[PDB]
């Protein structure tokens, strides 16, 4: 008959990419999955070229990055693609999660949990990458987050002595970070395949939340050409960002050699960790702060178990919709408070914003949910 239905590989490709019944409803908010996948393999490619021109010796790491950006041909476009492709990678990650929450697709248990494990892996991978250039900000942020791992009594002290390689961030810490940054995106790719497997086993979602089992359409050539359109859009965004002002996001302070004595006063990591960093310093405890960081991502774990609305979506519950956009503005509030150092107005509104983060996602979604349950004669 055909190769496609009798060959053991094209059975899998036919059941993943071609005869996949897609819902005929999804807007551009659903494009971020394929964009995350393409950004992932593009990060693999640019990082692999970086790996062909890199020498992880701490005395010569800074000079090695310099020689990449100067004398290796096109090493500057490869490095800038890798860094700001990581930036757009986390942008598409946040739009993917915001899609999967606001359009109510978090009724699925296991795909959501696999996504959260993916979140852990990508956050650690991006931090190891950000440590790798061995600049000032890299070195001191590495020391900060290593000490936050040391915050646990009785369980983690030898764990941090173990990941030190010695007294502090020595050269051995740098080679450990190079190896884990250099392997962990493949674990990310495998868990992304399992993410995709549970989704293609259960089925997709749609904007309304109504099960779309009456209007399935094939995946090709509708969403293939749609995601290629999304790819060209993402490529023009990333190439504008790396060909007009490539220092639009990255730190100016991270371009010095790692002076191991300074700690310049405007210390912060890159913007994507800063709201996760903002929950820390706006809570007056060491151990309470590091546990609150961990409980932030564990709140992202918990959230399917607090759904008590008898709808699937938030397209039709406008009060819960207002509360969710309040949570959006609170996220970008925490981002900007992470973007500024500790001052007294910033202390006030930082405690304000972090308490409002936890109180909205832990508590306010079931309250507005039971309001919407009662309010429609149910």
């Amino acid at each position: 008959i055909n190769i496609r239905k009798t060959h053991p590989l094209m059975k899998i490709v036919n059941n993943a990419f071609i005869d996949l019944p897609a819902p005929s409803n999804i807007s551009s908010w659903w494009n971020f999955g394929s964009l995350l996948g393409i950004c992932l393999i593009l990060q693999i490619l640019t990082g692999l070229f970086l790996a062909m021109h890199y020498t992880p010796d701490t005395t010569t790491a800074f000079s090695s990055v310099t020689h990449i950006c100067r004398d290796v041909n096109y090493g500057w476009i490869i490095r800038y693609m890798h860094a700001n492709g990581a930036s757009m990678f986390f942008i598409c990650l946040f739009m993917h999660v915001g899609r999967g929450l606001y359009y109510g697709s978090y009724t699925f248990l296991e795909t959501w949990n696999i996504g959260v494990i993916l979140l852990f892996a990508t956050m650690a991978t991006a931090f190891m990458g950000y440590v790798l250039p061995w600049g000032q900000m890299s070195f001191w942020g590495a020391t900060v987050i290593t000490n936050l791992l040391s915050a646990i009594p009785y369980i983690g002290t030898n764990l941090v002595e173990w990941i030190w390689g010695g007294f502090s961030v020595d050269k051995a810490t740098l080679t450990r970070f190079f190896a884990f940054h250099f392997i962990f995106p493949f674990i990310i790719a495998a868990l992304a395949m399992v993410h995709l497997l549970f989704l293609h086993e259960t089925g997709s979602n749609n904007p309304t939340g109504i099960p779309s089992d009456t209007d399935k359409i094939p995946f090709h050539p509708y969403y293939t050409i749609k995601d290629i359109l999304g790819a060209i859009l993402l490529i023009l965004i990333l190439m504008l960002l790396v060909l007009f002002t490539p220092d639009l996001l990255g730190d100016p302070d991270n371009y010095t050699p790692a002076n191991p004595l300074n700690t310049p006063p405007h210390i912060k990591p890159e913007w994507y960790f800063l709201f996760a960093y903002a929950i820390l310093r706006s809570i007056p405890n060491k151990l309470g702060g590091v546990l609150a960081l961990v409980l932030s991502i564990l709140v992202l774990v918990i959230m399917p178990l607090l759904h008590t609305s008898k709808q699937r979506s938030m397209m039709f519950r406008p009060i819960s919709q207002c509360m969710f956009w309040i949570l959006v503005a609170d996220l970008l509030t925490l981002t900007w408070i992470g973007g500024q150092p500790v001052e007294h107005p910033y202390i006030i509104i930082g405690q304000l914003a972090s308490i409002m983060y936890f109180l909205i996602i832990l508590v306010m979604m079931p309250v507005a949910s039971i309001i919407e349950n009662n309010l429609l004669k149910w």
Binding site: D19, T202, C322, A329, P345
Partner: protein, 73 residues
Amino acid sequence: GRQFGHLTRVRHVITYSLSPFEQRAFPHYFSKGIPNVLRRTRACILRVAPPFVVFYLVYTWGTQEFEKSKRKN
């Protein structure tokens, strides 16, 4: 999850569709699409604004408070 065919049981439906070549790409694009996107704008921005305008005002107010701490000293 699986392929087509074994999903639902629907009688009583007749669907009309036209070839893509016979139809134009943009039949009345700007003359309809701009009232459509203004309508989608009008149907959402009162649900969108009361987080963001409050965020911008709190941003300017905390900005003024920090600056005012750095105006006298």
